[PDB]
Amino acid sequence: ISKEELIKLAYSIRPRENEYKTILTNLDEYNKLTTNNNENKYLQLKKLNESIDVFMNKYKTSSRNRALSNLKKDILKEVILIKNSNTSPVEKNLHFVWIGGEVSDIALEYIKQWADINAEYNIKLWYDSEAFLVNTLKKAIVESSTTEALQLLEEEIQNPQFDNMKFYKKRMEFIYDRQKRFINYYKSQINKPTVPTIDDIIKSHLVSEYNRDETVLESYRTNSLRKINSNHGIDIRANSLFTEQELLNIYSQELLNRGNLAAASDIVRLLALKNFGGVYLAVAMLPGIHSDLFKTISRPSSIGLDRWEMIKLEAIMKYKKYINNYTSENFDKLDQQLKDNFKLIIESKSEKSEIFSKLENLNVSDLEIKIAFALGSVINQALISKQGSYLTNLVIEQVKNRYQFLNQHLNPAIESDNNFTDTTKIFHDSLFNSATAENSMFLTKIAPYLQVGFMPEARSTISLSGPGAYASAYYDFINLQENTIEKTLKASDLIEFKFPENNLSQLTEQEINSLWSFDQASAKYQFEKYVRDYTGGSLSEDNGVDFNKNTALDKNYLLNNKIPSNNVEEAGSKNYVHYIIQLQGDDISYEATCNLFSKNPKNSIIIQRNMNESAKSYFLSDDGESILELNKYRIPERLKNKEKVKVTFIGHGKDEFNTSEFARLSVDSLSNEISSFLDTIKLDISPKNVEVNLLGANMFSYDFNVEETYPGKLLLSIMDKITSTLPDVNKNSITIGANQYEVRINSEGRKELLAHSGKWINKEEAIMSDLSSKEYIFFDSIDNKLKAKSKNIPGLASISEDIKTLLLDASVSPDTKFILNNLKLNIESSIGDYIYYEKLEPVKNIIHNSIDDLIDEFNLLENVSDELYELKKLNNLDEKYLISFEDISKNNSTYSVRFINKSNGESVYVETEKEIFSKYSEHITKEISTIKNSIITDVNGNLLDNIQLDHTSQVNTLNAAFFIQSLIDYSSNKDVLNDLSTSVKVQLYAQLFSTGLNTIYDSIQLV
Amino acid sequence: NGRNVVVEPIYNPDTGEDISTSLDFSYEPLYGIDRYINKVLIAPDLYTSLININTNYYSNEYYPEIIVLNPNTFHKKVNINLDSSSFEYKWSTEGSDFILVRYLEESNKKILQKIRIKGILSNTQSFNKMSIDFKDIKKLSLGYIMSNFKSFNSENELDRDHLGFKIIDNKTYYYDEDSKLVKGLININNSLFYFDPIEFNLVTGWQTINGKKYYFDINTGAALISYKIINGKHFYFNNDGVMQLGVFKGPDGFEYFAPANTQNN
Structure with missing residues (x-):
């Protein structure tokens, strides 16, 4: 703010220029145009910023650019000062979205709880009157495509080394063919003078291409309508939400062309908040809890913050239930005085009057919107906006721009009526030929758009109409630009735009259930469920020779046949010891321990815990060709000075998503095992940083919620043991990590994989996906939850270069070429995410x-x-x-x-x-x-x-x-x-x- | 500050005069004194959109790495202009900075020119600001370099900050004050030590420095001073540690320390 102090502060030898006079006149207009209305003032400030930007772009070596950059920083303070002017409450509404199907009873209980606590707030539920069978149609298409692909792959099901991604590609091809047939049938019923309805067209296609009953589907349409209309349902077609034909086409292509109900719900959210000013909450949301009524209970150090919050919700809805099937397994852990304290402190109060908070005052500006948070990034769960909000218009304009870009680069592939592989090759060739330096990550993200929700690792809605669009529009509002595609946001500005925590209260059993994504482990277990359901006789691959085989260490085979044939090398530091532990008596873990000893033939020891009495440490001496049978799990004097330890447990895991067992042990049993092993380490090594690995089948690394996973609780117990017993190892110098397969390079140079059959298989796409998906989870030093370590970016680049060479190879099948292309896109998106999310x-x-x-x-x-x-x-x-x-x-x-x-x-x-x-x-x-x-x-x-x-x-x-x-x-x-x-x-x-x-x-x- | 070169634009005396927007660095003024200099920290200013780094000066012996600070200019893109070819580069990442390495072999002399761009991977504003120019190609980007060039693991660099004798391998080093890793014939407390000037590690046994002969102990590493018995023979050194040829007195009496090719050879 300087009407006349800008002059005689930025002096140049050249006289006053026309752009400088325009800047001075626009600044004078800003200072002399003062009103309580904020939108015209914001547009005036945006014009001033654009004038300053175009002057500094035109004249580079001018002496006024320093003072104008200081004025630009003052403008970036002034936009926050302008937004923090109209302190007015929002008009009282709630919005919920459920499209295409029956409303679930748990979400019904959640919205009735929201209505019961907030009686003065007029709730609403948005739904489509003509879309009620899209979920059943999608399920029928998925099941028909699963049968069609599995009948073709039945001769390769019997191979235990079968890869799942080719079956998923065939299922995606059949899904795309069925969707093309359905959209041809839908567009074939537009030219008639009479008008049909969407549910009628879906019903006709179902009874024509399946064994569906017209009366049964009519009954399913009719009973679903009365449930919604009783439970505060309002139609999206009766109101004037759908105004612009571009938004109609966006909704049609994200509902009928693609069965993507969350993507349809995103435009539904924006249109509802643009038309009627209100407060949006998701259907898996709960009202906030006062911190004063639970602060008397001390939180234990062995339980994470999210675990403590969800067991607080389980303690509240365990006694006074209000939910038919609220699982309290995490609440049922051993804390008798904490359970009694929770019982008395929730039975000493009234019913739903002080337990859950109220929304009696939500003071926001006209320009401002507030959004929920999830691990340092925004998430479209809780929104607060007035009617006709400017930044909400910015979000819907960004969604319009992104969908216009996607439609412009996709509609040639839509009109070119071909199969799925040629269509997506045309789409990729159209996308990558227009990749500039500003939206390469955006195009890499929206590249697998056609296979979202069907193939694993396909996330495009986050860039199209979700948190990426929200963060881009937040940047666009704060920094006074127009249509930014992908740029970062400061944490200070994000917490300035933050939703209140005691009004959000995200943590919910349904939220945790929906937090899982279709990853590699989910795809593998869904494939195993599909095979076990289609074939009555399931194949048991875990039996093998796994039990009653106490194989001793073949020293001659280890020394003369493995270490001289070590074709692999590492490029890391060697100030560590590799405490290799074998936990099962089978040839698979025996060969895995032998291969890890080939990886590190100098610092590593071998401990076999398959037997108890013949358990010791085997390692090379100071000279070569000498293996010591030293007991007590001790180390030589040359390994007594390393600052790092790298323990490694090799075993098996049962086929369960988020498996709670490893090598037929448990979390607490393995924590006691590591403690008993650590009782012998303490007399030899005083390290600075520790490291725990986990190798074996059905052991993955998860990135969304690191708590409730197998490395999370194990990580918490082991970090408690490290910070209690071992000196000079800090809390943040902890590392857990899980790996599935084993990597070996033979004499040829190819990367080899070991399976349960005992032979070596060149499963290159599986081993590259495993190497690109292995993570490390550590405890952060800001006294927060567990965080994931940054991956080896040169390692990811090396994997991407190997993928590029194998795609440039000649004797490679097109299915594996497609799989490796998708893996390269995933690796490039991962590196772009590390750059974008400030994770480095x-x-x-x-x-x-x-x-x-x-x-x-x-x-x-x-x-x-x-x-x-x-x-x-x-x-x-x-x-x-x-x-x-x-x-x-x-x-x-x-x-x-x-x-x-x-x-x-x-x-x-x-x-x-x-x-x-x-x-x-x-x-x-x-x-x-x-x-x-x-x-x-x-x-x-x-x-x-x-x-x-x-x-x-x-x-x-x-x-x-x-x-x-x-x-x-x-x-x-x-x-x-x-x-x-x-x-x-x-x-x-x-x-x-x-x-x-x-x-x-x-x-x-x-x- | 640790013997670090701070390359900086010149402050303009006249306020109304136009401000220069270029930075230049060359290895020419570091000739002779490169054996004392730790690192080079190029510090750009608000008016800096072009950086020229002349990497072709091959007559030096030690090449310090160059750490380019993150600028906050009003310019849309800042330019790095190296006068070298597109090949012989390997890129890396140590946390949140971009590492560029020029490894070339010539005249049976190893040259390892390392360039680091500090604080460039923190956000996409700093990531998309840099554009690097080479001799044969120009107007690149960091994403283009990550997609095209070969990558190497820079996490093997074990030589972090220390303060005393480190026995981090079979070799051993000194790691003096401000962590500079001394590399010559130096004295630390009272005795002379020798660190090999091409691999920085301490070497023992017989050594020859510019023709003169010193001896360094196997057990400790200090230079031997007095009349000492080595392998059953007799040698005499002065206080400087160099052996002397002549007649000098030991505890057993005077002796004769002859040169090579004599009556006994």
Whole structure:
């Protein structure tokens, strides 16, 4: 805000230019156009920012660009100041969406709970009157395609080394063929003068292409309508939600062309919030809990925050239930006094009056919307908006732009009537030939658009109409741009736009059930369920020779046949020991331990826990060709100095999604096993960082919710044991990790995989997916939940390059070419996600820390300069006044600072209650006393310097010299008004030469 | 600060004059004193949209790595202009910075020129700002480099911050104050030590430095000083540690320390 202070602050030798005059006139229009209306003021500020941007783009080496960048930062503060003006509550509404099917009883109970707690809020449920059988049609299409592909792949089902992705590709091909037939039948019934309905067309297609009954489908349409109409249902076709033909086409292509009900629900959410101002909650949401009624119960350290919140919800809805099937398995863990305390503290209160909070005041601006959060990223669960909200219009414009881009690059492949493989090859060739430097990640994300919800690892709605669109529109609103595709958001701006936690309360059993995504493990277990349901005689592959085979270590085979044939090498540090543990007596884990010993033939030991009495440690000596049978699981003297340990457990797991067992043990049993092993480590190794691996079948790594997984609870127990027993290992120096397959390079150079049959199979796409999907989960140092480690980006690049070479190879089937192309797209999207989500940590060393220290010092300098400028503006002191920093004499409440005029030297006093100008004055007094004793004496104005040859006496003087020199030399922002440079120059001159400025008081000698 | 070179644009005295928008670096002023310099920190300013790094100066012996700081300019794209070919580069990532390595072999001399762009992978604004120019190709991007160029594992670099004798392998080092990894013939407390100037590790046994002969102990590494018995023979050194040829006095008496090719050879 500077109407006339912008001039004589940015001076150039050239005269005033036309763009500078336009900037001055638009700024004057902004300052003289003041009103309580915010939209016109926002548009005026956006025009001012665009004028400043086009002037700085046209004229590069101009001297006004520094002051204009400072004005741009002031504009970015002013947009928040503009948004925080209209503090008005939102009009009282609730919106819920359920499209195409019966409303579930659990979601019905949730929305009745929301209506019961919030009686004054008029709830609504949005639904489509003509769309009621799309879920059953999609299920029938999926089952028919599953039968069609599985009849073709039945001769390859019997192979235990079968790959699932080719079957998923065949099922996706049949699904796309059925969808093409259905959309041809739907577009064949538009030219008639009479009008049909969508449910009638779906019913006709069902009874024509299946054994469906017309009366049964009519009954299913009729009973579903009355349930919704009783449960506060309002139709989306009766109201004027569907206005623009582009949005009609978007809804039609995301409902009828693609069975993507959540994507249809996204445009339904935006249109409902644009038409009727209200507060949107998802159907798996619960009202908030007061923190005061549960703060008397101390939270244990072995239970995560999300686990504690969901067992709090289970404790509330366990006794006073209100839910038919609310599972409280995590609540049923052993805490008798905590369970009794929860029982008394929820039975000592009333019924639904103080347990759950109220929504009586939601004060938001007209421009602002608020959104829920999930692991540092936004999520479309809870929304608050008024009617006709500007940023909601921005979100629907971003959705329109993204869908226009996708339709423009997809409609040639839609009109080119071919099969699925050729259609998606045409789509990929159309997408990748228009990939600029600004939307490469966007096109890589929306590249597998046709197979969303059917093939594993296909997430496109997040970039199309979900949290990516929301974050892009938030960036677009904050930074005053137009149609940003993919750019990051600051965490400060996100928590400034944050939804209230006591109004959201995301954590729900249905939310946890919906939080799982169609990943590799989900696809494998769904395939196993499909095979077990189609064939009555299931194949048991886990039997083998697994039990009653206590195979000893063949030392001659280990020494003469495996270590000289080690064709693989690693490029990592070797200050670690590999505590390889075998937990089952079978040839598969025997060969796995032998191959890991081939990976590390120097530092690794072998422990076989399949038998108890003959269990020891086997390793090479200082010389080669010598294996020691040393007992007590000990190590040589050469391994007693490593700062890292890498334990590894090799076994088996039963076919269960989120398997709770490994090698026929449990989480607590394996924690006690690692503790009993650690009782022998403690006399040898005092490390700095530990590392736990997990190799074996049916052991995956999950990324959405790391709690409730097998490495999560095991990770919590082991980190408790590490932070209790082992010294010099911090809480954040923990690492769990799970891997499925085993990697070996033979003499040819190919990567080999080991299966249950005992032979070696070149399952290249499976081993590349496993290597690209292995993660590490650690405990973060901000006292938060468990987080996932950053992957090896050069390793992912090497896997992508190997995929590129195998796709450029000649003797490769097109199905495996398609699978490897999809895997390359997934790896590129993963690297783009690490760049986009700010998941990459900064490095910490002596060189890097000083740069951040100077950056923080410059930021503090700018803050002190801005606060001094507003103090000089408020107290009406002109440019000839110099602040003293040695006189910070204060009252009991306020801080008094004095000023010295440069013309006659009077000492006025002003009062301002600010913590700044006290600690900063202390800092600039300490960094002047740091160089004061670096001077021995002054002779006739010449200062005799004293040099210190000690290193620790040179860093302090250099740091003080940098700190004084930066803020005595740098022209700060708005420094023509306040002269902090000469204000500290006078203090430095006084302290160096004379008695200090706190003692000098005579006006003539002061001048 | 650790003997780090801070390349910086020149502050303009005249306020109204146009500000230059280019930075240049060359290895030419580091000739002779590159054996003392730790790293080079190029620090761009608000008016900086072009960086020229002349990497062709081959007459140096030690090449410090270059750490390019993250700028906050108003420019849409800032340009890095290396005068070298598109090949002989391997890229990496250590946390949130971009590592570029020039490894070329010539004249039986190994040159490893390493360039690091600090704080460039933190967000897409800094990721899409950089555009790197080479001799044969120009106007690239970091995503293009990640897609096309070969990648290598830079996490093998074990030489992190330390302060004393580190026995991190079979070899051993010094890691002096401000973690500079001294590499010559140095004295640390009172005794002379020798660290091999091409692999930075401490070497023992017989050594020859510019013709003169020193001896370093196998057990410790210090230079031997007095009349000492080595393998049944007799040798005399001065306080500087170099052997002397002549007549000098031991505890058993005076002796004669002859040069090679004598009556006994």
